[PDB]
Design a protein around this ligand. Sequence first.
Ligand code: HEM
Ligand SMILES: CCCCCCCCCO[C@@H]1O[C@H](CO)[C@@H](O)[C@H](O)[C@H]1O
Ligand SMILES: [Ca+2]
Ligand SMILES: [Ca+2]
Ligand SMILES: [Ca+2]
Ligand SMILES: [Ca+2]
Ligand SMILES: [Ca+2]
Ligand SMILES: [Cl-]
Ligand SMILES: [Cl-]
Ligand SMILES: [Cl-]
Length: 639
Amino acid sequence: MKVITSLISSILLKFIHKDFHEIYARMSLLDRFLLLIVHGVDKMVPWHKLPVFLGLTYLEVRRHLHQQYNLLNVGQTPTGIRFDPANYPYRTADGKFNDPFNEGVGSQNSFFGRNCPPVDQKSKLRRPDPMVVATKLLGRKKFIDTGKQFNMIAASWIQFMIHDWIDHLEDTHQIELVAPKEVASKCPLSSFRFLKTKEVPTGFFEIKTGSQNIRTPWWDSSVIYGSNSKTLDRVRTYKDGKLKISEETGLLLHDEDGLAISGDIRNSWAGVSALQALFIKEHNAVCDALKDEDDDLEDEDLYRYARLVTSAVVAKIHTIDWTVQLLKTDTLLAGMRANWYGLLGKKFKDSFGHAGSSILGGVVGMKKPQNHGVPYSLTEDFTSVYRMHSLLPDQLHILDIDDVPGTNKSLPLIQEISMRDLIGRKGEETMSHIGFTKLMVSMGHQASGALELMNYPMWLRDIVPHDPNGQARPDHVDLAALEIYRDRERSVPRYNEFRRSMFMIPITKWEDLTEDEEAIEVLDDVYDGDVEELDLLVGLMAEKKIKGFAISETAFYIFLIMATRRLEADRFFTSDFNETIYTKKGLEWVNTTESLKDVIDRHYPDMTDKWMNSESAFSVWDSPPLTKNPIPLYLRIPS
Ligand code: HEM
Ligand SMILES: CCCCCCCCCO[C@@H]1O[C@H](CO)[C@@H](O)[C@H](O)[C@H]1O
Ligand SMILES: [Ca+2]
Ligand SMILES: [Ca+2]
Ligand SMILES: [Ca+2]
Ligand SMILES: [Ca+2]
Ligand SMILES: [Ca+2]
Ligand SMILES: [Cl-]
Ligand SMILES: [Cl-]
Ligand SMILES: [Cl-]
């Protein structure tokens, strides 16, 4: 029967796109049927046009297929000797001892995994020229924003997450890119130097080398706690479990060089510093709540509990508040909330407990972590799809918070500040003058840039990059050109091959990608008509967006699997998401915090009442009021 059904699965191969016939051979019988269904929907009414309940059904199936076929291990698993996870009921300084079966999984300096098989591009690192790509396709011509959907707090937030998640170890070898004559007059830098990505031998045939992640890939708030014991030590006060902050201003402290003191400040700016400070306040407020409950808790005990609570609050806010604004559709409102609370919902879970399955109860609080047989990591492909620098504006619009708010709590502009004055060391100085409140309100009221072509801040095409400790390097970089180089250097498939690897129908011509006729002509020029040479970053920016999505669908499918993975693979969101590990009050703190607004309201009790008219703190704050849709969420049809 299995052999006969296999023969029928080879018969139905006549309905699958030819480019998937290879991944199809890897697949189980049921999964072959599931691919037939997913692919069928892709060819008919796309998932994002279905009624929410069917959209979610599609995403559940597609996500399952990515979990089975788009998780590739890189390097030997850092198993180590056997350990008891009960001996590590807290987030370790370097992320070790989380995976109960592999001590090194998710730790600092672990290998980046992959979602798509690598494509060696060493012979075409400069084809087409990355500075030509940057100049013609990326550099911002006219600023394009995201309307009211996704403000500068939301742009700060995603960078704040990147600083927790991913950074590539560099080698000592220097590379130099030179601007060709054709574009040199339009390049801020005529040439620039940077460090090669460290390419470490794995010892395997399939994937022979890998990159190492110098941030813990666990979602452990290493952005404020550091990624090892040495960097943790720098942020600890050693009093009452707390972290360093200015009590007077609510801003970060600075060292003798004027560099901010937090977990990871590499290539940072004022918006990130604001979020670091806010979450240090959160951590410290958890310490206060726990020290009161129990006066027998020492500094180390308080720190450990407060870190569990704070990192869980951040993950929750990201999942059910931030992502819901990035992906502003009914289907993703339902889907992201279901990741946390399950299809059955918050009220049910809060009343009756976890239903037992991830679908019904959420991945959060599941009985065991799940890695789908592949050790947890954040991947090369994940890095590429989160390259979202076009979110940044040219200037920050500082508002007059002394003025009486107008209709929808609007405020007038008082000054425009170049983003150059808000980044790195200079940004800390500028922020000291502006202050937390003025910066936060101004960011709330300002739209981000959109992820479209020709919208990459020109100021990023000549920036001073940092060593991992935030110290300035003498060699400036053109970040737009550099990102193109990195994706190639790290063997991430270019746009069309990436799509095929993720069982998405590849494009055959530029018109499949975008309706913008002038952009099509630039694409055709840069790539000499060849859709197979189209860079991943370029394609991700160019791709026509689903209504309400700030990102491409191609990026979204990586988000779909990896966001779920960050929660489900981690003991502290699953087997150890309970009152014993978090304390009763600690777990309550997580379970009653639903949004960034809740956190802002905790530390700045009047800010959102005075100045925020939107429901989410990640939406532009002077948005008009919205009347709720009376149609039940799971039944809504997109228009
Ligand atoms: C003022 C703000 C920012 C500055 C100065 C900055 C600068 C940089 C620099 C210099 C690099 C390393 C380039 C290299 O050597 O490979 C980098 C990497 C990166 N940035 Fe930004 N960036 C900023 C904001 C953002 C934002 C808003 C995002 C949105 C998600 C973002 C996402 C990333 C990602 C995913 C990487 C790759 C990390 C890796 O290779 O592991 N950055 N950035
Ligand atoms: C795992 C796949 C998840 C569900 C896929 C179901 C798609 C079929 C839906 O067709 C039904 O009839 C219509 C014709 O008018 C469709 O357009 C409409 O949306 C839908 O109500
Ligand atoms: Ca981390
Ligand atoms: Ca000290
Ligand atoms: Ca006690
Ligand atoms: Ca306004
Ligand atoms: Ca033209
Ligand atoms: Cl270090
Ligand atoms: Cl995400
Ligand atoms: Cl919760």
